[PDB]
Every structure is written in structure tokens, then in C-alpha cells.
Amino acid sequence: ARTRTNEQVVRSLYVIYEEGDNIAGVPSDLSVLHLDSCTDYNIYG
């Protein structure tokens, strides 16, 4: 919980994950490539 002056931990959320490539998190609801210029890239991880 974030107030005007403090942050206080109240609960815990547990995660179970397996590394791979089947599921991908995305900004919202891909194969866009900019060529011949400086770019920030994510290519197959």
C-alpha cells in the first residue's frame, strides 16, 4: 500500500513459472522490423 509518505507490504502473491517461449506477455491487444537505422530490438529473446 502506497500512501502520501509510506509504502507498507500487506500480502504476498506467489508465482509458478517454467522458462520457454510458448506464452508471451505483451503491452496490450509483433514481427515489426526497422532496418538501416538504430533500434532497440528483441529478437527471439
Binding site: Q8, V9, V10, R11, S12
Partner: protein, 51 residues
Amino acid sequence: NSDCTDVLHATAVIKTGTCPFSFDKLNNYLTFNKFCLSLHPVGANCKFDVA
């Protein structure tokens, strides 16, 4: 319901556990911006062991 016998007599000791200081050393001019003790594990930075 009964008091502790000679064989069963025990004393309570607070051991360091995972904390970066000892309980008996708190009275040795240690300085904090916040120090606060709890019986619940949520949000805790470390813990002592009661034995």
C-alpha cells in the same frame, strides 16, 4: 497447570536467527530510523529465534 520441575526447567533465549544484529546487542547504541517487532511474518526484514 504445574510449575517446571528441576529436570524440566528451561529458560527463554532469543537467538540471532536471520537478523543482522543480536537481541542482546540492541542496547549497545544501535541507531534506526524505524524498529518494530511483530508476531506475524508479513513484511518482515528478518526474524529472531525464540528457544
